């Protein structure tokens, strides 16, 4: 796709994902998904389809009651911007039951940690593709 725009967006997503980092079924990009340099070489569409699916997965979680429900996010939360950026990126690539309140703060932390790892993988993919493809 548009390697450069994807590279720039994925970089901003990495920044957003760490911006509120506190003091401390799931799509994961696996070895077999071909998001490593050799794999992107041969055929990159597999990787990009896996990244697209990961992005849609996170945007849906961030728009769910885990994040919109109590304890309410503060007005300074970057979850709003993260969500828009995840949508923004998924778009460049191809243009889930109720949670218990007492569990949401921990679920949000776990999802955001997992999101940090995912976005970093995507950022490396788009940077390599931009530089070599």
């Amino acid at each position, epitope marked *: 796709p548009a390697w450069t725009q994807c590279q720039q967006l994925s970089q901003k997503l990495c920044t957003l994902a760490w911006s509120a980092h506190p003091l401390v079924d799931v799509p994961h990009i696996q070895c077999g998904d071909g998001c490593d340099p050799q794999g992107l070489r041969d055929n990159s569409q597999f990787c990009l389809q896996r990244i697209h699916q990961g992005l849609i997965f996170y945007e*849906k979680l961030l728009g769910s*009651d885990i994040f*919109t*429900g109590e*304890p*309410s996010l503060l007005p300074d939360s970057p979850v*709003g911007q993260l969500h828009a950026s995840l949508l923004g990126l998924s778009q460049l690539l191809q243009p889930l039951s109720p949670s218990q*309140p*007492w569990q949401r703060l921990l679920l949000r932390f776990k999802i955001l940690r997992s999101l940090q790892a995912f976005v970093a993988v995507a950022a490396r993919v788009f940077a390599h593709g931009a530089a070599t493809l």
Partner: antibody
Amino acid sequence: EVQLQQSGPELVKPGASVKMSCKASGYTFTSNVMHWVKQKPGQGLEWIGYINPYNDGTKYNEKFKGKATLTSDKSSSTAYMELSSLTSEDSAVYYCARNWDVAYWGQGTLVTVSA
Amino acid sequence: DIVMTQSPATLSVTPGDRVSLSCRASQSISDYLHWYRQKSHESPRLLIKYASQSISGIPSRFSGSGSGSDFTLSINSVEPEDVGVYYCQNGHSFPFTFGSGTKLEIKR
């Protein structure tokens, strides 16, 4: 400024249904869930359920499943509750409320079920 | 379902006095407990959230404490405008549930 404006009082026949609305302003509609709560005249409060407008996901109190249906219209930032097969037991004030911890409830809609 | 029990049902107090309202949960709810007051003809108004956290615009007279199953709302020096029914609420797990209320009456 935040407002949750509910629709007017309603006299409903037993067996009929009624749909009431809660128009939200002054905040991002999709950023909070919208709860509905029942309160019988001079009595306590019961939570009915909520809707999450972004995905239309709902969560009900088991006591109200099948009595209440929550929906939302993002285009008008309005949450709705429809109550089905009404009996005198459903006569009450019904409130809409944002997330509990943000302190905003609608003014209530009084439903009277009578022949 | 978690049952929230409040006591006393009614309280008659002299302004200036300190007041204590109790709320007990049938199961531990950590600090996911909110307090409201509902005055005649109004919707309930959040006073304290998460057991002890203050709410912008509410008098410093009000404070809450407790964690787990037993909670207390304290009014430092009661004022006339405090009259109304005070409810506690399980903000912890489904279904959310409210206590039966304590009606506060003022002596004059």
